[PDB]
Structures are given as structure tokens and as C-alpha cells.
Amino acid sequence: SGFRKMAFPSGKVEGCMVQVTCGTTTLNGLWLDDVVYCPRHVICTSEDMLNPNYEDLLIRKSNHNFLVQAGNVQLRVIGHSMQNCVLKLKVDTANPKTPKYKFVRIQPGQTFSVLACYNGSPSGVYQCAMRPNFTIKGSFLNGSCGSVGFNIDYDCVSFCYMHHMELPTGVHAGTDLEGNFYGPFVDRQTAQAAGTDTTITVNVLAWLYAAVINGDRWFLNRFTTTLNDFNLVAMKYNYEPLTQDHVDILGPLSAQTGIAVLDMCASLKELLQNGMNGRTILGSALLEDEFTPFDVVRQCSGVT
Amino acid sequence: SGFRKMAFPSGKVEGCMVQVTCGTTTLNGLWLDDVVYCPRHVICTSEDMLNPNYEDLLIRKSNHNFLVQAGNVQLRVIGHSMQNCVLKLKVDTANPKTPKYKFVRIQPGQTFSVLACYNGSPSGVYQCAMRPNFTIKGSFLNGSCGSVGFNIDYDCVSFCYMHHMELPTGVHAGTDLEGNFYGPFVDRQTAQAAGTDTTITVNVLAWLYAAVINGDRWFLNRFTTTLNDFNLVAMKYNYEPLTQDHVDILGPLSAQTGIAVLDMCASLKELLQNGMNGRTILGSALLEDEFTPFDVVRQCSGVT
Ligand SMILES: O=C(Cc1cncc2ccccc12)Nc1ccccc1
Ligand SMILES: O=C(Cc1cncc2ccccc12)Nc1ccccc1
Numbered sequence: 001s002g003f004r005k006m007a008f009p010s011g012k013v014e015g016c017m018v019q020v021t022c023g024t025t026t027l028n029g030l031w032l033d034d035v036v037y038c039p040r041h042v043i044c045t046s047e048d049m050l051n052p053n054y055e056d057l058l059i060r061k062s063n064h065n066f067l068v069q070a071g072n073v074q075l076r077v078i079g080h081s082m083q084n085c086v087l088k089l090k091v092d093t094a095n096p097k098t099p100k101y102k103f104v105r106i107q108p109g110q111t112f113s114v115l116a117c118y119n120g121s122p123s124g125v126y127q128c129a130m131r132p133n134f135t136i137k138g139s140f141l142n143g144s145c146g147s148v149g150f151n152i153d154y155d156c157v158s159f160c161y162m163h164h165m166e167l168p169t170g171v172h173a174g175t176d177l178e179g180n181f182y183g184p185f186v187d188r189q190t191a192q193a194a195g196t197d198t199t200i201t202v203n204v205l206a207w208l209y210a211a212v213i214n215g216d217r218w219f220l221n222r223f224t225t226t227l228n229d230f231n232l233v234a235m236k237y238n239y240e241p242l243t244q245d246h247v248d249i250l251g252p253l254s255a256q257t258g259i260a261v262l263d264m265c266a267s268l269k270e271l272l273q274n275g276m277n278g279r280t281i282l283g284s285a286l287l288e289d290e291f292t293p294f295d296v297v298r299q300c301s302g303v304t
Numbered sequence: 305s306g307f308r309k310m311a312f313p314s315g316k317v318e319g320c321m322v323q324v325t326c327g328t329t330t331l332n333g334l335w336l337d338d339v340v341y342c343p344r345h346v347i348c349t350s351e352d353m354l355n356p357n358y359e360d361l362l363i364r365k366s367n368h369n370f371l372v373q374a375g376n377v378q379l380r381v382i383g384h385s386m387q388n389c390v391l392k393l394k395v396d397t398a399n400p401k402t403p404k405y406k407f408v409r410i411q412p413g414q415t416f417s418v419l420a421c422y423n424g425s426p427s428g429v430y431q432c433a434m435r436p437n438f439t440i441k442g443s444f445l446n447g448s449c450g451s452v453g454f455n456i457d458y459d460c461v462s463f464c465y466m467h468h469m470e471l472p473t474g475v476h477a478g479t480d481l482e483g484n485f486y487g488p489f490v491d492r493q494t495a496q497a498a499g500t501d502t503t504i505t506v507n508v509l510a511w512l513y514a515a516v517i518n519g520d521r522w523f524l525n526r527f528t529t530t531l532n533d534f535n536l537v538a539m540k541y542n543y544e545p546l547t548q549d550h551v552d553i554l555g556p557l558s559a560q561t562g563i564a565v566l567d568m569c570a571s572l573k574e575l576l577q578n579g580m581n582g583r584t585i586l587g588s589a590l591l592e593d594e595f596t597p598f599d600v601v602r603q604c605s606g607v608t
Binding site: 003005007116122166276278300304 | 426
């Protein structure tokens with residue numbers, strides 16, 4: 001028993017982190033096979049970021065201007081190309097520590113592990129969610145760009161996120177491993193607005209199921225509701241509308257607990273309308289939405 | 305910016321996890337040099353746990369009864385000994401992945417990373433604190449015994465905890481790497497009581513400093529207090545008494561923010577007496593006590 005915001009073991013990803021330097025800018029890169037992936041803003045100076053013309057900026061750079069260092073050994077750059085907002089530096093040596101991997105574009109609401117890095121060296125690992133507004137609420141300082149988000153399926157690492165920027169509002173924005181930003185964000189020092197951040201309803205429900213499995217049952221009531229009635233309450237509280245897909249996805253948790261999904265929705269509805277009244281659920285005084293139904297099942301079944 | 309419950313990168317520890325089997329019981333072991341460390345309750349059956357005589361039980365076991373497996377290769381056991389509540393299985397092969405390491409007994413209030421494992425395979429990593437009552441609020445299922453807690457200083461892993469048991473109350477108990485339980489707990493299936501769990505005051509203060517550094521300043525007031533006045537309020541709320549040592553330890557955070565420690569104590573005092581009034585601090589609706597002042601400084605400075 002017990003319920004924690006658990007991250008995937010980061011060892012497979014640590015073996016891929018390298019330092020990429022371009023002029024005075026140093027950030028992190030991901031070394032997989034003979035390719036180093038990093039944010040393209042490595043080629044920018046503080047002045048360039050205001051309105052950078054990356055194609056023009058990249059033309060002034062040659063293979064030898066990109067210093068790639070894995071641990072203490074220098075990698076030789078034999079090719080460079082820009083794929084959307086990521087630079088792909090072709091190196092002459094394949095990473096001997098390359099794990100089995102995929103590049104995946106995650107959906108909003110999905111979760112992933114972040115290995116926060118500085119100078120190609122990992123400093124910490126934490127679990128987070130892609131917000132419905134496509135931002136992430138991470139913990140990143142300057143130097144952390146190129147730090148990656150991933151999930152692991154037994155031995156295959158699915159790289160889903162590369163950190164690029166912190167918006168003036170303190171939230172984080174980045175790309176998938178093909179250089180495509182999640183959301184409307186651009187890699188430019190300009191006024192960028194994240195949309196309204198809504199609450200991942202299916203995740204909160206999954207976490208309520210985790211609470212019940214772990215003995216915290218105080219919030220369970222004698223009521224039920226319907227999808228349309230629950231959604232009327234969800235919209236008022238800036239919660240994502242719950243669909244039959246979400247109900248089906250909660251099927252295993254509903255079967256494990258013997259509590260119907262709509263019954264859990266009525267409990268959630270009362271928690272929204274009345275608050276926690278000073279009580280806690282799984283050591284939290286608010287409704288947690290950064291555990292998918294898959295994360296709950298995995299944590300409560302010990303998937304290695 | 306951003307503040308997350310960050311764990312140390314677990315790669316160095318993953319390379320030490322092995323599976324230890326003794327009869328029908330399989331748990332995790334820590335392989336460092338030519339020694340495998342694991343909970344001594346590996347030699348018990350369900351009936352033994354009621355009142356086990358471990359010296360008598362261990363005598364019926366020989367080197368060949370302890371099956372140690374690292375990945376898919378079997379390790380040959382050439383020696384076995386009991387050191388307090390841990391078994392030390394001497395193997396004939398040194399772990400080629402043994403990192404630089406220390407065995408340290410942590411203090412209550414200190415934090416550490418847990419690499420939760422099942423069948424010698426890691427499943428997740430999370431950050432936690434040794435509670436003042438010496439329990440840990442982890443996420444462990446059956447099979448997780450032998451999972452370790454650690455801290456990293458650049459390249460040296462300091463092993464501080466080995467998971468042994470879940471108390472009937474859902475909290476977790478374990479030992480240091482010398483087999484000594486943290487707290488009054490014994491490795492027996494009996495009624496064991498954890499003391500009153502108090503709140504780590506210095507940690508909450510450090511987290512209030514992290515909040516101020518990260519832009520959350522709403523809780524800052526025009527008041528101050530004294531150590532004795534603050535402690536009068538701390539005792540009422542089951543908070544640890546704050547000492548001059550704690551004030552000194554908060555020195556770097558107080559210098560960074562320009563907010564005196566006693567001024568932060570007055571804010572904490574008002575948060576205790578009046579609650580958060582529906583507001584949040586660093587995305588939390590309660591006072592977080594699982595970040596030491598060292599964790600805050602590290603996270604806010606990017607120590608790799
Ligand atoms: O935002 C970043 C990098 C960054 C990321 N996370 C956290 C950061 C904290 C402080 C400084 C920088 C951080 N780059 C950038 C700079 C200007 C305009 C566009 C992008
Ligand atoms: O508590 C444990 C192992 C354990 C640990 N964490 C979580 C667990 C969850 C379920 C079952 C077992 C767990 N061993 C033990 C059994 C009986 C008496 C004394 C100790």
C-alpha cells in the first residue's frame with residue numbers, strides 16, 4: 001500500500017544525456033545511435049531570441065561549431081540539420097548505451113517522467129503530466145533545455161518531450177523528439193499565452209480509485225449521477241468533460257474496487273461542490289490529476 | 305522556475321538490484337562489490353513471521369538455498385551471514401556496476417530517493433522523508449522488500465534505507481544497510497505502533513522559502529515572531545520545535561530571499577492558525593514538509 005507520484009527509473013535515459021555547446025550557449029542533448037538531438041535555440045545568443053531567423057542563423061554554423069561532449073569524451077560532429085525546432089547533430093560514434101526506443105507524441109492528459117539535466121549531467125527525476133493546455137508544470141532552471149520526458153515499457157523507452165522554454169508565467173513548453181512544439185508555443189522570447197488550464201477529470205477519478213484501494217474511503221457517498229449531470233458540474237469547475245471512453249478506461253479500476261464509474265463521479269461532484277472540509281485524500285488537500293488510470297493500475301500492481 | 309518533489313537519478317542504483325529467492329520467498333537484494341544485502345525475513349514463510357527465531361531459521365539454510373539472480377545470470381553464493389535484520393550473501397563475482405558508495409544512517413526529517421523494485425527489477429523512483437516517528441510513507445507492494453533509499457553526492461551513492469515491512473496502519477518500516485531498523489520496529493508480524501507523526505518544521509520553512517523564490521508570495525505578512533513564541537504555536541499543531549540550528553540551516557534561503565527566518569516563522573504561524581483559506585502554495589493545499597533546506601537550495605541551483 002501507499003501512493004506516490006512515481007517516476008520511471010531513469011538509468012536508460014541517463015546513458016543518453018550529452019552536453020551540446022554552440023558558442024557561449026550550453027544545453028543538453030539526447031544521444032541515440034549516431035544522432036544527438038537538442039533544442040535549435042542552442043545557436044542563439046540573448047539578442048537572437050527576440051526574433052530569430054533560425055534558417056539564417058544555422059547557415060552561419062558549421063559541424064565544428066557544435067561541441068558535443070558525453071561525460072568527459074568529445075564527440076566528432078559529421079552532420080547537422082534542423083527538423084522543426086530540434087537540431088540533429090550526426091556524430092561518428094553510435095551511443096553504446098542506446099536503449100530500445102521510440103519517439104512518440106503524447107496526448108494532453110498523459111503523464112511522463114522528466115530527467116532534468118544541466119551540462120549533460122542529470123540532477124533529478126520527477127513525474128509530471130502534459131496539461132490540457134499543452135504546458136508542463138516542471139522544475140527547470142537555465143541550462144535545463146534538452147532535458148527529456150519519457151515513459152518505459154519493460155525495456156523500450158518512449159521519448160515524448162524535450163524541454164525548450166519557460167514562459168513568462170513560470171510554466172514550461174517544449175517539443176516532441178521530431179521538434180514539434182506541444183501547443184501553440186514558438187521558440188522565441190515573445191508574449192506567449194497558454195490557454196486556460198483545465199483539470200484532467202479521468203485522472204482525478206483514477207486517483208480517487210487509488211485512494212479507495214489504499215484505504216481512504218471517507219469521500220464515498222450514497223449517491224450516483226449521469227455523464228450529462230456530472231459534466232454540467234465539471235464545466236462549472238473547469239474540469240475536462242468525461243466521455244464513455246474515459247468510463248471504459250476506468251473499467252479495470254471500477255472492477256477492482258467494485259465501485260461503478262458514475263458512483264465515483266457523484267463522489268467527485270460532492271467534493272467539487274463542497275470541498276474537502278479540511279480533510280485529505282492520499283495525503284493531499286486538493287484533487288490530484290497527474291496520475292492516469294494506467295499509472296494507478298501500474299503502481300497498484302507493481303509493473304517493472 | 306517550478307518546484308517538484310524531485311528524486312535523484314536512479315541509474316547507479318538500478319545496476320545494483322538483484323533478485324534473492326529463499327524457498328518460496330522472493331525479494332530484492334542490493335549487490336555491491338561481492339556482497340548481496342537483503343532483508344533477513346527472506347528465510348521466513350507466512351507462519352514464521354508471527355514469532356521468528358532468525359538464528360534458528362538461518363541455521364537450517366546453506367549457501368545453495370539462497371538463489372541470487374542479477375538480470376538473467378545466476379550468482380554463486382559462497383558465504384552467508386546475518387548482520388542485525390539484513391542478510392549478507394557473499395557472492396564469487398564483484399558487481400561490475402558497483403558505484404562509489406557509503407552506508408549512512410539518516411536522521412528523522414532527512415529526505416532520500418527510493419527505487420521501488422520487484423523481482424530484482426526496478427519499477428519506479430520517488431522522493432520521500434524519514435518521518436520524525438521513523439516511518440516512511442512510501443509506495444510499496446508485496447515483493448518490494450529489499451528496495452533501497454539513497455542520496456547521491458555527484459558520483460557517490462549514500463545508501464540509507466532498505467525496505468522491510470508495511471505496518472498494519474499502511475506506513476512503512478525498514479533498516480539502514482547495517483540491518484538496524486529506523487525506529488522501534490521489529491521484523492515480526494505483530495502489533496507495532498508508530499509514535500505520533502509530527503511535522504518537520506524546518507522542512508516546511510524551507511518549502512515556504514522555495515515558494516517565495518518561485519513567485520508564490522501571498523502568505524507573506526507584515527509580522528514577525530520569536531523562537532519561543534513560534535514554538536508555542538508549533539507544539540499546539542504537532543510541529544517539531546524549531547532550534548537555532550534550524551535557523552542557521554535556513555541561513556542560505558533567508559539570504560537568497562532577503563526574508564529573515566523569524567519573519568518566515570510568523571507567516572507559518574498565521575498559516576497554521578488561519579489555514580490556507582482555499583489558496584495554494586507551490587500547487588499544494590497543505591504545508592509540505594518533505595523538502596529539506598538542502599533539497600530546496602539544490603533544486604533552485606541545479607546541483608548535478
Ligand atoms: O526559457 C528558456 C530556457 C529555460 C527553461 N526552463 C527554465 C528556465 C529558467 C530560467 C531561464 C531559462 C529557462 N529559454 C528561452 C529564453 C528566452 C526566450 C525563449 C526561450
Ligand atoms: O510487510 C511486509 C512486506 C511488505 C512491504 N511493503 C508493502 C507490502 C504490501 C503488502 C504485503 C507486504 C508488504 N512483510 C511482512 C509481512 C508480515 C509481517 C511482517 C512483515
